[PDB]
Design a protein around this ligand. Structure first.
Ligand SMILES: [K+]
Ligand SMILES: [K+]
Ligand SMILES: [K+]
Ligand SMILES: [K+]
Ligand SMILES: [Zn+2]
Ligand SMILES: [Zn+2]
Ligand SMILES: [Zn+2]
Ligand SMILES: [Zn+2]
Lengths: 192, 194, 189, 191
């Protein structure tokens, strides 16, 4: 924005760099960078920021509910006392209260297909369209693995793992964490 | 955007229009409009994004731990079994992996002073210290009352109240909800730091 | 209105949304939205549409009489010759025949308590009673070099303040709010 | 409003009641009653809201600048020291600052063709275009005439006349005053 728009346009004119590259290189907010790619004839832009995947995983005989913001890879997970629609519904309401949950992809099992979960979704305005999860499950279990001895109860280990996953594992063009990506993707979405 | 920055910038030299006005009047994303105001040397746009306030409030014989993002008004709350450091620590831990929590302000209750919470804060790199909290518990309790009927258990009502507060109560110059504001405050605090 | 009442009703049934929000979200006239709230047992509605605050301020050695529509924030102002009741009463007369002014709040200012003002108030059916100055001053400052006489700069600032400073749920200007507020009062009359 | 919207609609499918009738018979706000009419295939709910007519009239050797909001009949008037662009431009600025003035219609006087007035218009975003204002011009003088002895200076007499015209002369299907019509017209055009 210190002429970042013109510097970026010339750069794109010659090399046709994607928006992530231009956003990072010239310090432009994503909405601006994307518009440049939009204005180009020889290009095109590159999951809805409101799509989430939910599923349960098991460890130490305990149940863990996991939610994954597909577009960013941001995770939210909790050790729940029982694989019941009620516990899942409660978990959804909380999730829905902090993020713009629009549609949730889940399996057609007893729990996620329960009437309680459906009630929550209806209330929250979440449509259920019912391996991004197999990856998260195993990455989360690995982080829990590498940090398990720092906590007596799994609950805490799990929360430590979520913390590490969303804030201490960086990558990509901007070298962002998953936590910064969800916040960025959604702030950008608000911009349009 | 269709050379809108151009027109907006022109109109601004004359009227020195609000960012909300230029965004609306010229169909520009608010961040671009805000930049026009920042560029103008006759105007100026109008709390640290890492400051949160925690407190325990009571309703129907239950305990509700509430966390407020001071700069945004964004809330996060939960019914906990009892007012203990273990519950507080766990709550804090979940909060921290979710948002960039750097400083936390509390009332000094034994639960916030506990070694368990202190250990939680050290682990997650959070500094402890110590009207927003008070006023907020009131607004939440009020929404809880309006919604109580729709739920059997209070914990569900509490969560509906949080949802409503963060997403369905808008206002301010931007007409945003606290949920939309925190994402803006934090996303911005990232860019500047890049 | 395209079955917007129906949609707003269910939104409120769950989240008990305020009337401004429902008016804006479902494109319903304020009177319809406020009725949804009034019908609900869990809520209560939302300053009187006819209340105005009148004051004087100075700039460049001149007197600026400022009138503020408390509920909307809309403003009206003008450079007057002297801070005398006579000028104040004439200003009021002009205002009153423009907006439904029912009550005017002011200080004990000599020119605000003069008999000539009460005369004007009594004629127009206005009842006398009893920060915006700073905002006006500030806008005038951003626009000063665009005008010669202070008069014109003042009006330019009023224009700016009333039409180019949007905000709130509907992103309205003070100018749009006062009209909407008053039109809405006509609906419930 | 107490299910009155429902009743009103039922009756309309039968009588095709006027909006004033329904607003009155079912205690509904006029805007709700107008919608019912607009929603009916068999009925029709009967000038641009941004158009104003401007002109000067004389009385007692002084100049009165009058502005008319054509769609509502609403008025704004003032005694100006002289028929010059300088005075017209200041007047338009004040006006444009309170109402959404999009286009002004005037005669050909150098009074309104002045470059001073053109600068004022360009600044306020108003378009120019050199007998709706003749009727108001005469009725204003009439009201002034009957209220004159109530004020020492012409200045105050004129403002009393404007006040009376805008808020004390009702009519039309809605039984509204010009002051009420412009607001309704402007508020509706906003949405
Ligand atoms: K493209
Ligand atoms: K600035
Ligand atoms: K009520
Ligand atoms: K019709
Ligand atoms: Zn390209
Ligand atoms: Zn400016
Ligand atoms: Zn309600
Ligand atoms: Zn009909």
């Amino acid at each position: 924005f210190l002429d970042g728009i013109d510097k970026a346009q010339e750069e794109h004119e010659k090399y046709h760099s994607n928006w992530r590259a231009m956003a990072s290189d010239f310090n432009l907010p994503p909405v601006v960078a994307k518009e440049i790619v939009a204005s180009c004839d020889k290009c095109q832009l590159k999951c809805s920021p409101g799509i989430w995947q939910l599923d349960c995983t098991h460890l130490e005989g305990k149940v863990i509910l996991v939610a994954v913001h597909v577009a960013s890879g941001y995770i939210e997970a909790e050790v729940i006392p029982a694989e019941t629609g009620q516990e899942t519904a409660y978990f959804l309401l909380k999730l829905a209260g902090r993020w713009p949950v629009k549609t949730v992809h889940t399996d057609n099992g007893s729990n996620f297909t329960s009437t309680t979960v459906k009630a929550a979704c209806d209330w929250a305005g979440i449509k259920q369209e019912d391996g991004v999860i197999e990856s998260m499950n195993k990455e989360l279990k690995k982080i829990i693995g590498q940090v398990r001895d720092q906590a007596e109860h799994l609950k805490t280990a799990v929360q430590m793992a979520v913390f590490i996953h969303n804030k201490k594992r960086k990558g990509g063009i901007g070298g962002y964490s998953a936590g910064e990506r969800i916040v960025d993707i959604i702030a950008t979405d608000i911009q349009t």
